[PDB]
Amino acid sequence: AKSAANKLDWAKVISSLRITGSTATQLSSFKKRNDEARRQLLELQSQPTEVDFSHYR
Amino acid sequence: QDLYLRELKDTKLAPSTLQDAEGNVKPWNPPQKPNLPELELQGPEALKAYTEQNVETAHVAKESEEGESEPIEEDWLVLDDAEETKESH
Amino acid sequence: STPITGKVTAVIGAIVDVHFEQSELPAILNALEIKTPQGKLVLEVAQHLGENTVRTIAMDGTEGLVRGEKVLDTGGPISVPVGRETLGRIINVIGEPIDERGPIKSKLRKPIHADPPSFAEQSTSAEILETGIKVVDLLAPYARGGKIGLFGGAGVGKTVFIQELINNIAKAHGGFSVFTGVGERTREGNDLYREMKETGVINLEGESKVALVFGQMNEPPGARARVALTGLTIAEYFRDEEGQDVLLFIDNIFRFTQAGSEVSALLGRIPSAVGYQPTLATDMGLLQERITTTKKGSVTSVQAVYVPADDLTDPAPATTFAHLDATTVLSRGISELGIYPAVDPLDSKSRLLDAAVVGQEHYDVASKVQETLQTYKSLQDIIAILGMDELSEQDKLTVERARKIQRFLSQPFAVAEVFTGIPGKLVRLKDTVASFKAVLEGKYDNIPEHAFYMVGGIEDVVAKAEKLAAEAN
Amino acid sequence: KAQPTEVSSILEERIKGVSDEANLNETGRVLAVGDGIARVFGLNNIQAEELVEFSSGVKGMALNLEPGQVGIVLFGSDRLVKEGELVKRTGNIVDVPVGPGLLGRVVDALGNPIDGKGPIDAAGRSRAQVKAPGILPRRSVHEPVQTGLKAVDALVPIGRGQRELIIGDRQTGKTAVALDTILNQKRWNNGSDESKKLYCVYVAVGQKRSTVAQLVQTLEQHDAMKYSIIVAATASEAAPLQYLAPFTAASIGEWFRDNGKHALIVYDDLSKQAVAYRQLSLLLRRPPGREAYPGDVFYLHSRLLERAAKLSEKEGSGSLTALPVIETQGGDVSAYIPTNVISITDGQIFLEAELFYKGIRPAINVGLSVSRVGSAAQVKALKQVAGSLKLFLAQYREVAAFAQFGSDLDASTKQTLVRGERLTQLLKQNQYSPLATEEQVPLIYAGVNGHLDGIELSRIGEFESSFLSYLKSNHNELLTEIREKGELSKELLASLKSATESFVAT
Amino acid sequence: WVRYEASLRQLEQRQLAKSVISRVQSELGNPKFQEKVLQQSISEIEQLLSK
Ligand SMILES: Nc1ncnc2c1ncn2[C@@H]1O[C@H](COP(=O)(O)OP(=O)(O)OP(=O)(O)O)[C@@H](O)[C@H]1O
Ligand SMILES: Nc1ncnc2c1ncn2[C@@H]1O[C@H](COP(=O)(O)OP(=O)(O)OP(=O)(O)O)[C@@H](O)[C@H]1O
Ligand SMILES: [Mg+2]
Ligand SMILES: [Mg+2]
């Protein structure tokens, strides 16, 4: 999924050789990498959102 | 032997009312009760912030919308601007 | 109780041996007493020799000491007055007011020798104290809860740097300050006393925010080695009982180890390296560990060290390096180059210079400044013999930028304006980092290098260049 | 809290029981006390190096056993001791508690819990002076210790049981590499495979308590304290305690080593160990040696360091890796203790301020920094499969060997110049950012097939970061395959080359 | 709310330290010092009689 999302992004960079000066498609790809990179970090740092009534309480 | 028993007894007279019981404290002039369990009970939240992060303020996330759902006045302009770029492309 | 009394057997320079009686042996580091015609001579006990004999250290001169004189035991370590009343009163190694402003009316008296505050230690290494001096703010920020280096040889300007700090920090700060002044010239102490009087920091009929301790080189070695602890005791009383931010100041910590070496030879111990005391690291650590941030309170201590014969590898400076976070070497070569302050930017160094604390932009600016200055030192040998024309174009650009930078690190002081003729100036951190980054980018390379000397911000450099091109050229 | 009250009551009752069961008569009498030294008349049958108790409550170790009176050093201050005090004998040689409850705690040289988190659960009690393993009960170093530093991994390998010295100057980064290794071990310290676990044990001899407070705050922030033990000997403590602490920590690590586990010891600033021993020997009127140091400082360091070893399969194939630190004055490695320690260790890691101010953050002098073990104790992925990771040492020697004296002659010289300077800019790393072998391999592999085409020097850092991103995304198969198998197969070499050239074209 | 409890643990021991001052000041004002020598006498008898 994550590798599949940008797999087609390596298709547009090949498509970008004939189309030079793309204002926002790369930015949209940049945006879809900026938020997605924020996704993996968010879930990996995400502890189980709970207070351990057994131990931590 | 007694010299340990009596100091063990001494631990049951001077600090018995200190924490073992709640008979305040005889040697001290300042009281023991209105410091820790009432003034310093809120002490941990007197060190951190109150009514905002101890209550924790479980706040609804601010909702962000799409591009105002107004495509016609921008998609064609983008399409017109796409013509401008592809002439320069 | 009965007064513990004994007989003096040996008086060896500053070392006195006392023979006592049945089970009358005093404690180590405990004040004794000799009724001298001049006054009171206390005999701090250093070691026990057995046979009811103890080896002691005299805090005053041992003139007129006859063997067999009556001695008296105080019963504890040297006791000094402590409290807010000490503010504005100049005291001594023993605690008597030497300001002749009447007797001291202290409420508490505390022992001189204490212990380090265990692991009740906080670590708040995030408070960059705004000093005003351009060089220190960039490459070695001073922490508000740390210990400050100030190294350097004779006549390198360490005391002037201390006066600049006391001018810029003490005035605009909420919290008491203590100046111990170990083994400096009495002239310097007198000037410092006067200046705090006129400035208003201490008022003879006011509040006063400084407790003045003083031990000069006129004191014998024992007093010069104990006065630092006496001032530290005042600092500790103000940090604990009052719960204030104290600002301990000394003039020279090297004199403490020097006096320790003085007393060590006659104390009867095998000499250590280059004739120092064997108990150098231990005693110096005992002295400099009591000075600490101390969870209930906080302290900043601007240390000051004298390097013997401009040797940075001398055992005392080498040992005191490890107990300091922010350091300042004040190399002499910079002094004969005319750049005052004479601090060496390549050896200043501090822990707070990290991107998380000082900021990413500041870290990058400091790193690039270090590179520009270090390229000059690397190419010095080639430049000295052959010349700059034998260098590459990039080498020429780097060396001229380095010259401009190292000339721009200079800053006038409000204390040493008599030695410069230029009024003192202060530069904020945000201003100096921006100016240095602007110079690094190459925005100012047509400006003559002389325009960076005795200036503040980059705007001052621009103005100086304008004048230089106007009338000078 | 009434519970500590009865705990103290039963403490006092066994205190009485222990105290009134001695009836000793050889209990000596203090003749004289010096600066932390006390000669005592008595203890006729005292053992050497044996612990004692003074009537005040201060401990002492029996160094000198000359006839008549005995030389006792003081674990603490001579504050409370006088002449004519009865000196209690322990009956045993100085000992330190050992066990698995040490993890997550901070103790002193003796081993008392000093962090203030309660008592210590000790599985045993070992000597401070134990004999190093013999010639046979050991095995050569083969398993590599992953430092997380590319310059310390691909260039100067270290492994289980070796002795790598961080030689260098003051505030050059000596503690940085050690703490980075401690943080890097978290990757495998969180698993289940005990053969890959590396518990960390660290000594702090002479460093001020504020520094160790910042350090322990550091390990707990990155969640490394759970597998680390800190023994502290600040300059405030007496010289005997500082002199003893590294030996106690060596025993602590040897517990894991003999129990089949793997552990890492950092002998931080072993020089102040030497100066504390100097103070000890001089205060004992022992004849000094060269430059006032005691003669047997070489033996002191040898006995301490050689205890670290890689055991053989017969005893359990445990390991103990020594990581000592020595600070030199003005880069003078010809100094006595620096020479002894460079001759005692299994290699060294030189750090100098000049490269530090040149921009190189690790400041590793690859010219002098050498390891006595090369191919052994190195992950194979950073080895012959990568090819040049057998011989970057020669390449970095030659690039330094033609800087201006070996001025560029032809295109080969220019190519080597660009390659070397790009690599030196590539080896840079930042503190508190340990890395892993599976992403070491791609970066340096790119250093052989396309590195001069890097996007100018100031932007090769985000080049390496973006290369790591382009290999962690859409190319996780390469990273995995090279991280479990640990080497690069022929098809794996082809895939890695293809990926490197694909991002080169990018 | 944990280190406050931990600080509650540490502070509680601290007034127990000054409690010992109250305890020890109670220890010095007794005729037990006369009675305590008999405690050694019976104890030292039990000590060497064991041997
Ligand atoms: N900022 C400055 N501007 C001008 N002159 C300065 C400055 N700082 C120091 N000096 C000069 O340096 C010289 C020595 O000054 P100072 O008394 O501070 O020396 P020092 O290093 O503290 O001395 P010592 O080793 O005797 O304690 C004086 O001639 C003084 O004018
Ligand atoms: N990779 C790095 N990136 C950034 N800063 C670093 C790096 N390595 C070291 N430093 C900095 O270098 C300085 C010294 O590093 P470190 O804490 O390892 O000290 P050290 O060399 O062990 O010296 P000491 O003997 O004085 O403790 C510190 O200011 C630290 O932040
Ligand atoms: Mg001076
Ligand atoms: Mg370090």
Task: Kindly write down the DSSP assignment for every residue of C303-339, as one continuous string.
Answer: ---PPGGG-TTSHHHHHHHTT-SB-----HHHHHTT-
In angstroms, the CA D269 to CA D265 distance is: 12
Of the candidates D388, D391, D348, the one whose C-alpha atom is nearest the C-alpha of residue D372 is: D348
Would you tell me the crossing angle of helices D336-344 and D270-283 to the nearest 10 degrees?
Answer: 120
D20: nearest CB among E9, E12, E43: E43
For residue B20, count other CB atoms closer than 10 A to its CB.
14
Place of tokens 């400050």: C148
In angstroms, the CA D228 to CA D219 distance is: 8
In angstroms, the CA C367 to CA E18 distance is: 53
In angstroms, the CA C215 to CA C202 distance is: 19
Q: Are C57 and C77 in contact (CB under 8 A)?
A: no
**Which element (helix H / strand E) includes B7?**
helix B2-10
H helices present in D195-296, as ranges: 209-221, 239-258, 270-283
Radius of gyration (C-alpha) of chain A in whole angstroms: 19
In angstroms, the CA D400 to CA D408 distance is: 12
Strands C90-91, C210-213: pairing is parallel
In angstroms, the CA D22 to CA D17 distance is: 10
The dihedral formed by the CA atoms of A25, A26, A31 and A34, expressed in degrees to the nearest 10: 160
Amino acid identity, position D215? L
Radius of gyration (C-alpha) of chain C in whole angstroms: 25
Q: Strand, coil or helix: what is D406? A: coil
Residue C448 CB-density burial (10 A; 0-12 exposed, 13-18 middle, 19+ buried): middle
Q: Are B24 and B31 in contact (CB under 8 A)?
A: yes
The H helix count followed by the E strand count for chain C is 13, 18
Largest distance between two CA atoms of chain B: 105
Half-sphere exposure of E33 (CA within 13 A, CB side): 6
A–C contact: 3+ Cβ pairs < 8 A? no
In angstroms, the CA C174 to CA C243 distance is: 12
Q: Are C267 and C56 in contact (CB under 8 A)?
A: no
Q: Are D102 and D229 in contact (CB under 8 A)?
A: yes
Residue C205 CB-density burial (10 A; 0-12 exposed, 13-18 middle, 19+ buried): exposed
**Which element (helix H / strand E) includes D498?**
helix D490-505
Q: Strand, coil or helix: what is C381? A: helix
In angstroms, the CA D323 to CA D175 distance is: 10
Chain D residues within an 8 Å CB radius of E43:
20
Q: Are C387 and C129 in contact (CB under 8 A)?
A: no
- How far are the Cα atoms of A35, B63, B70, B71, C28 from residue B66, in angstroms, in the given order? 16, 10, 9, 11, 81
For residue C376, count other CB atoms closer than 10 A to its CB.
19
Dihedral of CA D488/D490/D492/D494: which sign?
Answer: positive
Would you state the structure tokens that stand for residue D352, as one six-digit string? 């100098």
Q: Are C263 and C225 in contact (CB under 8 A)?
A: yes
Which phi-psi region, left, alpha or beta, contains residue D23 (left: φ > 0; alpha: ψ -120 to 50)?
Answer: left
Task: Provide the CA C220 distance to its chain's centre, in angstroms.
Answer: 20
Dihedral of CA D152/D154/D156/D161: which sign?
Answer: positive
Residue D70 CB-density burial (10 A; 0-12 exposed, 13-18 middle, 19+ buried): buried
How much distance in Å is there from the Cα of C403 to the middle of ligand 2?
A: 28
Q: Strand, coil or helix: what is C6? A: strand
Q: Are D219 and D229 in contact (CB under 8 A)?
A: no
**Method for this entry:** cryo-EM
Of the candidates A7, E29, B11, C61, the one whose C-alpha atom is nearest the C-alpha of residue D9 is: B11
Would you tell me the crossing angle of helices C429-441 and C458-467 to the nearest 10 degrees?
Answer: 60
Would you state the structure tokens that stand for residue D193, as one six-digit string? 């495979």
Q: What is the DSSP letter of C16?
A: E
Would you state the structure tokens that stand for residue C382, as one six-digit string? 């080639």
Say if the Cβ atoms of B85 and A21 lie within 8 Å: yes
Amino acid identity, position C322? A
For residue C66, count other CB atoms closer than 10 A to its CB.
7
Omega prior to C341 cis, within 30 of 0 = yes
H helices present in D113-173, as ranges: 150-153
User: At CA D340, angle to CA D338 and CA D342, rounded to 5?
Assistant: 65
In angstroms, the CA D196 to CA C194 distance is: 68
Would you state the structure tokens that stand for residue C160, as one six-digit string? 């002037």
Give the active site residue among C185, C368, C396, C403.
C185
Q: Which residues are registered as beta bridge partners of D200? A: D228, D264
In angstroms, the CA D136 to CA D310 distance is: 11
Q: What is the DSSP letter of B19?
A: I
Say if the Cβ atoms of A23 and B85 lie within 8 Å: yes
Chain B residues within an 8 Å CB radius of D16:
1, 4
Of the candidates C30, C29, C38, the one whose C-alpha atom is nearest the C-alpha of residue C60 is: C38
Residues 6+ apart with CB under 8 A from C431: C456, C457
The H helix count followed by the E strand count for chain D is 16, 17
Would you tell me the crossing angle of helices D437-445 and D461-472 to the nearest 10 degrees?
Answer: 120
Strands C147-148, C301-302: pairing is parallel
Would you state the structure tokens that stand for residue C275, as one six-digit string? 């004739």
* Interface of chain E toward chain D, CB-CB under 8 angstroms: 9-10, 12-13, 43, 47-48, 51
In angstroms, the CA C328 to CA C160 distance is: 13
Strands D199-206, D228-234: pairing is parallel
For residue B84, count other CB atoms closer than 10 A to its CB.
9
Each residue of E15-48: b (16+ CB within 10 Å) or e? bbeebbebbeebeeeeeeeeeeeeeeeeeeeeee
Of the candidates D494, D479, D490, D399, the one whose C-alpha atom is nearest the C-alpha of residue D441 is: D479
Half-sphere exposure of D267 (CA within 13 A, CB side): 35
Distance between the two ends of chain B, CA-based, in angstroms? 101
In angstroms, the CA B14 to CA B27 distance is: 8
Say if the Cβ atoms of C49 and D82 lie within 8 Å: no
Chain B residues within an 8 Å CB radius of E12:
19
Of the candidates C317, C314, C311, the one whose C-alpha atom is nearest the C-alpha of residue C331 is: C311
Q: Is B14 on the interface with D (CB under 8 A)?
A: no
**Catalytic residue at C403?**
no
Beta strands (DSSP E) in chain B are none
E22: nearest CB among B2, B6, B14: B14
- How far are the Cα atoms of A25, C167, C186, C327 from residue C151, in angstroms, in the given order? 59, 19, 21, 7
DSSP of chain A, one letter per residue?
A: -HHHHHHTHHHHHHHTSSS---SSHHHHHHHHHHHHHHHHHHHHS---SS--TTTT-
Task: Provide the CA D297 distance to its chain's centre, in angstroms.
Answer: 19
Of the candidates C111, C91, C93, the one whose C-alpha atom is nearest the C-alpha of residue C103 is: C91
Q: What is the DSSP letter of B34?
A: T
CB pairs under 8 A between A and D: 10
The dihedral formed by the CA atoms of D111, D113, D114 and D118, expressed in degrees to the nearest 10: 180
Of the candidates B66, B82, B75, B72, the one whose C-alpha atom is nearest the C-alpha of residue A23 is: B82
**Which element (helix H / strand E) includes C148?**
strand C147-148
DSSP of D278-335, one letter per residue?
A: HHHHHHTTPPP-GGG--TTHHHHHHHHHTT--B--TTTT--EEEE--EEE-GGG-TTS
Dihedral of CA D45/D48/D50/D55: which sign?
Answer: positive
Q: Is C176 in the pocket of ligand 1 (CB under 6 A)?
A: no
How much distance in Å is there from the Cα of C156 to the middle of ligand 1?
A: 5
Say if the Cβ atoms of D282 and C292 lie within 8 Å: no
In angstroms, the CA D333 to CA D336 distance is: 8
Of the candidates D65, D206, D240, the one whose C-alpha atom is nearest the C-alpha of residue C281 is: D206
Would you state the structure tokens that stand for residue D379, as one six-digit string? 């992950």
Q: Are D166 and D230 in contact (CB under 8 A)?
A: no
Of the candidates D458, D445, D456, the one whose C-alpha atom is nearest the C-alpha of residue D503 is: D445
Ligand 1 atom index nearest CA of C335? 12
Whose C-alpha lies nearest to ligand 1, atom 29? C155
Q: Are D40 and D26 in contact (CB under 8 A)?
A: no
In angstroms, the CA C247 to CA C251 distance is: 13
Q: Are C330 and C161 in contact (CB under 8 A)?
A: yes
In angstroms, the CA C440 to CA C405 distance is: 8
Residue C21 CB-density burial (10 A; 0-12 exposed, 13-18 middle, 19+ buried): exposed
Place of tokens 């690291």: C281
Place of tokens 């402003």: C101
For residue C311, count other CB atoms closer than 10 A to its CB.
15
**Which element (helix H / strand E) includes D38?**
strand D37-41
For residue D318, count other CB atoms closer than 10 A to its CB.
25
Each residue of D441-463: b (16+ CB within 10 Å) or e? bbbbbbbbeebeebeeeeebeeb
Q: Strand, coil or helix: what is C61? A: coil
Q: Strand, coil or helix: what is C145? A: coil
Place of tokens 């209105």: B34
Ligand 1 atom index nearest CA of C154? 25
Strands D199-206, D262-266: pairing is parallel
Q: Strand, coil or helix: what is C88? A: coil
Q: Are C332 and C119 in contact (CB under 8 A)?
A: no
* Mutate-to-test residue for ligand 2 from D147, D169, D174, highest number of ligand atoms within 8 A of CB: D174
Amino acid identity, position E43? S
**Which element (helix H / strand E) includes C213?**
strand C210-213
Q: Strand, coil or helix: what is C98? A: coil
Residues 6+ apart with CB under 8 A from D361: D173, D428, D429, D430, D431
Amino acid identity, position A17? L
Q: Which residues are registered as beta bridge partners of D93? A: D50
What is the nearest CA distance from B19 to chain D, expressed in angstroms? 6
Ligand at minimal distance from the CA of D174 is 2
In angstroms, the CA A1 to CA D383 distance is: 33
Ligand at minimal distance from the CA of D431 is 2
Of the candidates B47, D118, D221, D217, the one whose C-alpha atom is nearest the C-alpha of residue E4 is: B47
Would you tell me the crossing angle of helices E2-27 and B2-10 to the nearest 10 degrees?
Answer: 130
User: At CA D330, angle to CA D324 and CA D336, rounded to 5?
Assistant: 55
Q: Are C287 and C232 in contact (CB under 8 A)?
A: yes
**Which element (helix H / strand E) includes C53?**
strand C53-58
Q: What is the DSSP letter of D380?
A: G
The H helix count followed by the E strand count for chain E is 2, 0
In angstroms, the CA D416 to CA D419 distance is: 5
Amino acid identity, position B68? E
E36: nearest CB among B3, B14, B19: B3
For residue C310, count other CB atoms closer than 10 A to its CB.
13
Chain B residues within an 8 Å CB radius of E23:
7, 10-11, 14-15
In angstroms, the CA D385 to CA D487 distance is: 6
Ligand 1 atom index nearest CA of C164? 1
Residues 6+ apart with CB under 8 A from D269: C322, D174, D205, D206, D207, D325, D326, D327
**Catalytic residue at C184?**
yes
In angstroms, the CA D488 to CA C233 distance is: 65
C–B contact: 3+ Cβ pairs < 8 A? no
Place of tokens 């450099």: C461
Q: Which residues are registered as beta bridge partners of C147? A: C301
Residues 6+ apart with CB under 8 A from C7: C18, C19, C20, C67, C68, C69, C70, C71
DSSP of D184-198, one letter per residue?
A: HTHHHHTSS-GGG--
Of the candidates D415, D426, D358, D390, the one whose C-alpha atom is nearest the C-alpha of residue D172 is: D358
Of the candidates D15, D64, D3, the one whose C-alpha atom is nearest the C-alpha of residue D38 is: D64
